[PDB]
Design a protein around this ligand. Structure first.
Ligand code: 3Z7
Ligand code: CA
Lengths: 55, 249
């Protein structure tokens, strides 16, 4: 599932026994209830530009 | 950087400037509050290991604006497979003596997972390369941080489109028309890839035949090959001595 379009994950993808898939996020992010989206949990999450984010 | 633009202040907040005795050495990429990834070749000629400084929040080299954060480099970790004076395995992991403080001007770049990097990031065409390197081949270095958008090439295409060998620990990116490229003083700097609203570390400015030479592309360290090596080291206790050679794989 993960090889094709990142398994629909915004960030990391793990394939599981069967047709199961788990999306995951880098530290400083949490996975939303959609099971694909990552939201920041800290003020300065990695790979985001504050001056552009606050604009 | 040849043929790029000034990175607006705070738009490359993971960019690191490395200094030796106060002189510009190389670039680097902040990946969390204490770790910086750079190029192993940056350290081939270092004798004064204790005078190595990393600067975060840097933008304009002629002025101190208060956003700059300087830290002593406590450790330089290089893979065992890197041979000084050569190009393969061109990566270094630097531990800062004290963490930097994350601010609007100092933010880490995400070090991605290997699988995510190989199967997804490796197919994002364009990525950004940045540094205070030479603005031209045989020209002066930049006073303001420069940034350039470069397309990634499949190694087969790079080998065919070109006028050292390109190994599986490298990738080509750039243009063959002699207009746009990274340069000598940009070494160690980030090749950053955007994916679904987030930026990731995919490459390190490593080497090339001159700067923006017709029929040649920039060569970058393929960071995905080193994810596990980097992660294991970041989970390890510091060791005495600045330089550390660590087994690779
Ligand atoms: C460090 O030197 C270089 C690096 C890249 Br990428 C392209 C051209 C160069 O001269
Ligand atoms: Ca400055």
């Amino acid at each position: 599932i993960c090889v094709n379009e990142n398994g629909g994950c915004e960030q990391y993808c793990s394939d599981h026994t069967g047709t199961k898939r788990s999306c995951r996020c880098h530290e400083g992010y949490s996975l939303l209830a959609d099971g694909v989206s990552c939201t920041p949990t800290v003020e300065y999450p990695c790979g985001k530009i504050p001056i552009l984010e606050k604009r | 950087i040849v043929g790029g633009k000034v990175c607006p202040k705070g738009e490359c907040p993971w960019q690191v400037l490395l200094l030796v005795n106060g002189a510009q050495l190389c670039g680097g990429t902040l990946i969390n509050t204490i770790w910086v990834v750079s190029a192993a070749h940056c350290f081939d000629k270092i004798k004064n290991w204790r005078n190595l400084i990393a600067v975060l929040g840097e933008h304009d080299l002629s002025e101190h604006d208060g956003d700059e954060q300087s830290r002593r480099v406590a450790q330089v970790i290089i893979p065992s497979t890197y041979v000084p004076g050569t190009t393969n395995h061109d990566i270094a992991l630097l531990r800062l003596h004290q963490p930097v403080v994350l601010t609007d001007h100092v933010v880490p770049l995400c070090l991605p997972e290997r699988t995510f990097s190989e199967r997804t990031l490796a197919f994002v065409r364009f990525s950004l390369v940045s540094g205070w390197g030479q603005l031209l081949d045989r020209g002066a270095t930049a006073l303001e941080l420069m940034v350039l958008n470069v397309p990634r090439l499949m190694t087969q295409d790079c080998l065919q489109q070109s006028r050292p060998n390109i190994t599986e620990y490298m990738f080509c990116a750039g243009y063959s028309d002699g207009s746009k490229d990274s340069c000598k003083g940009d070494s160690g700097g980030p090749h950053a890839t955007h994916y679904r609203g987030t930026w990731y570390l995919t490459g390190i400015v490593s080497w090339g035949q001159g700067c923006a030479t017709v029929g040649h592309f920039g060569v970058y360290t393929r960071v995905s090959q080193y994810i596990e090596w980097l992660q294991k080291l970041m989970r390890s206790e510091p060791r005495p001595g600045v330089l550390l050679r660590a087994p690779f794989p």
